[PDB]
Write a protein that binds this DNA or RNA. Structure first.
Ligand SMILES: [Mn+2]
Ligand SMILES: [Mn+2]
Lengths: 161, 612
DNA sequence: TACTAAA
């Protein structure tokens, strides 16, 4: 059922629009949540996702983020290194990730070391944020135990730069 | 009725030393026609028969390669005929010293020749020049017995020289051919490019009239290094750091300035958030300690490159001036040969005696006596290129005896020698890790246990710092005055002589005796000026020249074509190629490059116009 | 009038 599929996506962690799931379905003969997720993962989020991230998260006020959800990375920059020398090893590696759900954009900082995310991460990949995530001064604090990479294959304009 | 042998050395000091070693105290010496070389006589046994000996020397190269007269006029030859339609002949160098006639008169009656020349690559070329000079005069062969010999040696002692005299061999022709090819290529490139550039820029812009614009396989890359450093300096965008530091006032007497684990943050908001989550705390909790033991390595044997670098950095002397001072000290009899590359003391060196001679100076008396009483540590093993032994002191000296310019060089040399012979430096490093809320901090300190060469080289010493307080994990200390500091990146400064020498050695541009010459040449041609701190700053002429070279054909400036050409020339040295073939191919490719260059000078003119 | 390099 459509309600069953939507609920399944709900506990899975994907918050997608009704028109998004209507557009992303293969054929309404026998639909499977697994194939829906697999085919949606390879597309852009701005056209299929919904609005679940609360407003004002860019600024303060809000303190904690609840729910696993799914976010899309737009850009990654190594904060602890200058722009000219991005391969310098004079500092511990800190990453600032610009994340989106299609409507509101947030910013996250690598509090601890994570190996599953690198500087050459293909833009457009999807991340799950299971657990309770700390919000400090409008910044999402990311740890290795509360971030999971779901992969991503969306057309890359990064190669141009 | 007994035959005579003739032995040629590359320098009179070497000739006299080898003659005195091989002749057990019996040596009759007299001057010759030149007045700059001496002839030594002795009687010995060679090839199983009694023989008279005659030892002499030649001052470096005997001949250098130059064009014929008609093509040395600069105004009657097109600077493109120099590549393939120009004969070249060898002409005497330093004509005041009649080397050819001296060798001819000294070798009138000899039967065997032994070449005691340097084991360098050009030693074989000098060997064959001497053989060309002497061979048509020697008294026949009287059968198939061999008359040409060559001895391989690297150290001037008793046993090494005796072994060299017992292990003779043959000379090599391919190395001489390689050196000749290198000489011909260098001449036919430099004299072709320089003529065209000088004759061009002296006819359009009058500001640089009566000035010489030179091109070569070394000067151009040397200038390129400096102008490329200038390019980095000009193309720089400063940024803004944000560093966080905190102070801990444990034991109510000391204030430790902790260092942030994360060294820098480039985002103001992230730095502010870290500061916000840290400053409202009144405790600092220790997490871990460390008491690792380390060691500072003693310096290696002295080398000409290291001596030049130290003279330029600390003593504040130019490379040419330092070389002149070293040469005067060597010829007066105070230091060894000042142009070596080896960084490895020979196994038969008299280290104990050389250290024992300098046991009366008030500066080193205690250290030398302690070393001689408690034994000497063996020197570090290093490169053993068979050129010459490293630079070591040879006689005692005092500040009154030597001048105020050579005394500093002698002091540095003897201090380096004692440091190489001496022990190592041991220091205990202590690091203490603090936690103030989420973040981490570290505090580091050093404490020396047993100084080694430090007392001989006080500038290479670990600084004295207060010992870190004792603390075990779980203790808590009061923390106060945590704050955020803002810093900006600093642009790099112009190249120094030490850095330029390091780069030239790394890229294989220039030899041991060529780096000062090239630096002085690029300074004299007004390409680069010398400023405070021994820094080389490019001028407008150098900048425009290198930029035009890059725009037209970069292969003339990049510091790898010299290495590629050396690799290509090594083929005939190893016998895997042909001299004519390699020389023709290289000359053809460079001629094509020159023809592409000649009809594209407007690219350099358009940059010359704005400058001048 | 020189030039290039190398002992
Ligand atoms: Mn030599
Ligand atoms: Mn050499």
């Amino acid at each position: 059922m459509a309600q069953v599929a939507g609920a399944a996506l709900s506990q899975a962690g994907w918050y997608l629009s009704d028109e998004g799931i209507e557009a992303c379905t293969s054929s309404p003969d026998k639909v499977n949540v697994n194939d829906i997720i697999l085919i949606a993962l390879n597309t852009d989020l701005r056209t299929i996702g919904k609005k679940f991230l609360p407003s004002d998260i860019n600024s303060g006020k809000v303190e904690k983020l609840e729910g696993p959800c799914v976010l899309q990375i737009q850009k990654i920059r190594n904060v602890a290194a200058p722009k000219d020398n991005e391969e310098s090893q004079a500092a511990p590696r800190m990453l600032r990730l610009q994340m989106t759900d299609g409507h509101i954009s947030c910013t996250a900082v690598e509090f601890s070391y994570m190996s599953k995310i690198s500087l050459n991460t293909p833009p457009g990949t999807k991340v799950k944020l299971s657990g309770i995530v700390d919000i400090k001064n409008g910044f999402l604090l990311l740890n290795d135990s509360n971030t999971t990479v779901l992969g991503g294959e969306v057309e890359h304009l990064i190669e141009k730069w | 009725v007994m035959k005579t042998v003739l032995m040629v050395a590359e320098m009179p000091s070497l000739a006299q030393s080898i003659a005195k070693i091989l002749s057990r105290g019996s040596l009759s010496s007299h001057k010759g026609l030149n007045g700059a070389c001496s002839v030594h006589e002795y009687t010995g046994t060679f090839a199983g028969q009694p023989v008279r000996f005659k030892m002499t020397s030649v001052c470096g190269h005997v001949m250098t390669l130059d064009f014929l007269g008609k093509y040395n006029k600069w105004d009657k030859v097109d600077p493109a005929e120099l590549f393939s339609q120009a004969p070249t002949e060898k002409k005497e160098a330093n004509p005041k010293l009649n080397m050819v006639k001296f060798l001819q008169v000294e070798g009138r009656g000899c039967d065997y020749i032994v070449l005691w020349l340097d084991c360098d690559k050009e030693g074989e070329n000098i060997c064959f020049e001497v053989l060309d000079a002497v061979l048509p005069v020697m008294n026949k062969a009287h059968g198939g017995e061999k008359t040409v010999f060559r001895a391989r040696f690297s150290s001037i002692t008793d046993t090494d020289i005796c072994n060299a005299m017992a292990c003779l061999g043959e000379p090599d022709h391919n190395e001489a051919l390689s050196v000749d090819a290198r000489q011909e290529l260098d001449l036919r490139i430099g004299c072709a490019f320089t003529r065209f550039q000088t004759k061009y820029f002296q006819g359009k812009y009058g500001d640089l009239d009566s000035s010489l614009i030179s091109f070569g396989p070394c000067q151009t890359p040397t200038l390129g290094f400096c102008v490329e450093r200038h390019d980095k300096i000009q193309s720089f965008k400063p940024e803004t750091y944000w560093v966080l530091q905190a102070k801990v006032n444990t034991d109510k007497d000391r204030s430790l300035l902790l260092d942030w684990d994360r060294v820098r943050v480039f985002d103001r908001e992230i730095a502010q958030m870290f500061l916000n989550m840290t400053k409202l705390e009144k405790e600092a909790q220790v997490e871990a300690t460390s008491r690792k033991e380390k060691a500072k390595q003693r310096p290696l044997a002295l080398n000409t490159v290291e001596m030049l670098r130290v003279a330029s950095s600390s003593l504040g002397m130019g490379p040419q001036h330092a070389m002149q001072t070293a040469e005067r000290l060597y010829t007066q009899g105070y230091i060894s040969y000042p142009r070596t590359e080896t960084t490895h003391y020979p196994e038969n060196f008299d280290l104990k005696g050389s250290l024992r001679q300098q046991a009366n100076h008030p500066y080193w008396a205690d250290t030398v006596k302690r070393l001689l009483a408690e034994g000497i540590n063996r020197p570090r093993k290093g490169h053993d290129a068979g050129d010459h032994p490293p630079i070591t002191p040879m006689k005692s000296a005092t500040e009154a005896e030597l001048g105020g310019d050579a005394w500093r060089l002698y002091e540095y040399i003897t201090r380096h020698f004692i440091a190489t012979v001496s022990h190592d430096c041991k220091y205990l490093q202590s690091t203490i890790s603090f936690r103030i809320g989420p973040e981490l901090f570290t505090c580091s300190g050093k404490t020396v246990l047993s100084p080694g060469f430090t007392e001989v080289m006080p500038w290479q010493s670990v600084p004295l710092e207060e010992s870190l307080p004792t603390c075990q994990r779980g203790d808590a200390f009061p923390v106060g005055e945590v704050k955020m500091l803002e810093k900006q990146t600093n642009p790099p400064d112009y190249l120094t002589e030490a850095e330029l020498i390091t780069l030239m050695e790394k890229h294989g541009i220039g030899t041991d005796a060529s780096i000062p010459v090239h630096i002085n040449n690029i300074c004299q041609r007004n390409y680069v000026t010398v400023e405070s701190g021994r820094r080389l700053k490019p001028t407008n002429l150098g900048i425009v020249l290198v930029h035009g070279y890059y725009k037209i054909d970069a292969e003339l400036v990049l510091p790898t074509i010299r290495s590629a050409v050396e690799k290509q020339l090594n083929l005939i040295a190893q016998g895997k190629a042909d001299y004519r073939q390699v020389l023709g191919h290289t000359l053809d490719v460079f001629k094509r490059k020159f023809h592409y260059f000649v009809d594209s000078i407007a690219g350099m003119d358009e940059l010359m116009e704005v400058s001048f």
